[PDB]
Every structure is written in structure tokens, then in C-alpha cells.
Design a protein around this ligand. Structure first.
Ligand code: ADP
Ligand code: N5T
Ligand code: MG
Length: 330
């Protein structure tokens, strides 16, 4: 049930000038990614994996959006909860995929930059889809990050990143939590999107000078909640509420990351049908437990490098992403 897709990033400039040989090969039509485990392009051993979808190095941001994000967003608009994880070693594209970047030299506006990732595209498309049709709606965003098992709010513009948030169990709905003090920013319109994201980037920058290897070791949960009151051309009123969680996981490479460690143990228990699932052994899994064998539709985008240097890690990621396919929720 849980959908897993692989995205291999292309060689960088440093690898181009050094004329690197890819040890990875993607076959989209056959949902397969093959890795050269022994060595030699003239002769060698290989490891093959089949996923729900595979995107090679030539894959652009727009292809990922139209193929994976567009459908999941439609479900969110129908009043469903959805989660998308980015998993992989540091430097393989987790952030590029989830957030994206700006083309150099102010060549485009944020709405047309082809390097934009899932988050900016999604927020722009929500206003694009709902403004057209006859739908009343409000959009709230929240960016919750975890570092060394502490919670930080990267959007509240009146607190510094030195102020950690407290988490409690929600006495109302079971297997859910309450983050005391988490800010929910209302995004009144499309032309309010960019600055909200810029605010988070800046606050993030201070978080980085305050905590060691912050961008590598933390988990970022960027959520978008949509309260909708649709009125068909007839006069029917549909009151739906969708929530989409975009999670940029800590680098999977190997102090300790309790949330990362627990995510793997939770997945293991879920696929091996073990009765006890360690959701409570980390903040990440308590916050997103409904996305792990719960009533949420979740997808996992595993990112990998094509360089022969990252062989061991590319195999761990692929092997990890494959087992996750067996998780069943709803
Ligand atoms: N699909 C891609 N196309 C072009 N460049 C990419 C792609 N994926 C990653 N990169 C580049 O690779 C580097 C690794 O980026 P990043 O997304 O920050 O990795 P991670 O978040 O997994 O640590 C960046 O310089 C980024 O621009
Ligand atoms: C300077 N840059 C790249 C940015 O400001 N950002 C900020 C950003 C971003 C920052 C966050 F905190 C949380 C989620 C995000 F998505 C992604 C981009 C972006 C890239 C292309 C088009 C629009 C936004
Ligand atoms: Mg990163």
C-alpha cells in the first residue's frame, strides 16, 4: 500500500570534470533501478530493485510533480490526509526534491523557476486549483523540525530557534499529539507564499549556526492544511479538510538520531507484522504515526547518488526503501 519511488540525481560538475562512471541505471518503464556492485562496465555483478516508480538523473522537477505530487494533492483536496517522505544519504537530493532551489542570476520568478521543488509548487497549485472552481478555502502552513529529539518552530517570527517546543499526547483523538506553541501561518493568497518560505530559510540559517550539522541531522515536517467549503454549480456545499505533510528526513548515512533509528524500527515491525510498533520511542514517529500504518496515504521518495563512492549507502537506501513497500495503511 505505501508507495515508494526512487530518484537518482545526476553527476555534479566536480564529477563531470573527473569523468565519473555511473554505477546506477534506471528503467522507468519497468519500475526498476540497477546497481553495479562488483565493478567493471565490461563485466560485472549487479543488484536490481523494483519500486512503484523510478526517476533517473534526467528527471526534472516538473516530472516529479506531475507524476507523484499532482495525484496526491487531488486526494488532499478531497478531504484526505497525505504524507510524502524524502529518504536518502546526505547530498542525494532530499531537499532539492522537497523544496527545490532558485535558478541563478534572478532568471525566473519563484512561480516559474524550473528548479522549484514539491513545496513551492504545491502551494502555488492549491491557489491555482481552488481559486478557479467555486470553492471557499483557507490555507495554513506549519514547519516543525526535530533536532536531537527537540522540537523547533521554523516559521514563528517572534521566537528564536533556541526555544524548543513541548509535545503531549492528545487526550481527544488517540495516537495523535499536541505541539504546544506550534505556529500555523495562514497563507491568504499565492503572492504570500514565497516570503513565508523565505522566512523559514532565514530562521533555519540561525538554527544551523546554533546546532552542529543541522541540515544533515534534523527532520523537517512542512505541513499544509486546507479548510474547504465547496459549492457545486447546483447548490451543494461540501465541507472538506485536507492535510499534506512534506517530510525531509535526516540524512540516512552512518552521535545518534533517535527519530531516524525509530523510523526504521517502526517500519520493520509494520512489515514483519509484529504486534508492538515502537511509535513512541521518538518524536518523529509519534508525530507522524498515522502516516505509518495508519489512515493516511503516504509515499516515500528515496534519493540516491550514481557515483561509485556512495555504493554502500546507495544499497542501504534502496534496500530500506524496498522493505517499506510492504507497509499497509488505512
Ligand atoms: N535532481 C537533481 N538535479 C540537479 N541537481 C540536483 C538534483 N538533486 C540534487 N541535486 C544537487 O545535489 C546537491 C545535493 O543537494 P541536496 O538536495 O541538498 O541533498 P540532501 O538534501 O539529500 O542532503 C545540490 O547541490 C543540488 O543542487
Ligand atoms: C532561496 N530559496 C531557494 C528559497 O527561498 N526557497 C525556500 C524554500 C523552502 C524553505 C523552507 F523553509 C521550507 C520549505 C521550502 F520549500 C524552497 C525555495 C524555493 C525554490 C524555488 C521556488 C520557490 C521557493
Ligand atoms: Mg538537506
Amino acid at each position: 500500500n505505501i508507495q515508494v519511488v526512487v530518484r537518482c540525481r545526476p553527476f555534479n560538475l566536480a564529477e563531470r570534470k573527473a569523468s565519473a562512471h555511473s554505477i546506477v541505471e534506471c528503467d522507468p518503464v519497468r519500475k526498476e533501478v540497477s546497481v553495479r556492485t562488483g565493478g567493471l562496465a565490461d563485466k560485472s555483478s549487479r543488484k536490481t530493485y523494483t519500486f512503484d516508480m523510478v526517476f533517473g538523473a534526467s528527471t526534472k522537477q516538473i516530472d516529479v510533480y506531475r507524476s507523484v505530487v499532482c495525484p496526491i494533492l487531488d486526494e488532499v483536496i478531497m478531504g484526505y490526509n497525505c504524507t510524502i517522505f524524502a529518504y536518502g544519504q546526505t547530498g542525494t537530493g532530499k531537499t532539492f526534491t522537497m523544496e527545490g532551489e532558485r535558478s541563478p542570476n534572478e532568471e525566473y520568478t519563484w512561480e516559474e523557476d524550473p528548479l522549484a521543488g514539491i513545496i513551492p509548487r504545491t502551494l502555488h497549485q492549491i491557489f491555482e486549483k481552488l481559486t478557479d472552481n467555486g470553492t471557499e478555502f483557507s490555507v495554513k502552513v506549519s514547519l516543525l523540525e526535530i533536532y536531537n529529539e527537540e522540537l523547533f518552530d521554523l516559521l514563528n517570527p517572534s521566537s528564536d530557534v533556541s526555544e524548543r517546543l513541548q509535545m503531549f499526547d492528545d487526550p481527544r483523538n488517540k495516537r495523535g499529539v499536541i505541539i504546544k506553541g506550534l505556529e500555523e501561518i495562514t497563507v491568504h493568497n499565492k503572492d504570500e507564499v514565497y516570503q513565508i518560505l523565505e522566512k523559514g530559510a532565514a530562521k533555519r540559517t540561525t538554527a544551523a549556526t546554533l546546532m552542529n550539522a543541522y541540515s544533515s541531522r534534523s527532520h523537517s515536517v512542512f505541513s499544509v492544511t486546507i479548510h474547504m467549503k465547496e459549492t457545486t454549480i447546483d447548490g451543494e456545499e461540501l465541507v472538506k479538510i485536507g492535510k499534506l505533510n512534506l517530510v525531509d528526513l535526516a540524512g540516512s548515512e552512518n552521535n545518534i538520531n533517535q527519530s531516524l533509528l525509530t523510523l526504521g524500527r517502526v517500519i520493520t515491525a509494520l512489515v514483519e507484522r509484529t504486534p508492538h510498533v515502537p511509535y513512541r520511542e521518538s518524536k518523529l514517529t509519534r508525530i507522524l504515526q498515522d502516516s505509518l500504518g495508519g489512515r493516511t496515504r503516504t509515499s516515500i521518495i528515496a534519493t540516491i547518488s550514481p557515483a561509485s563512492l556512495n555504493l554502500e549507502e546507495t544499497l542501504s537506501t534502496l534496500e530500506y526503501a524496498h522493505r517499506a513497500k510492504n507497509i499497509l495503511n488505512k
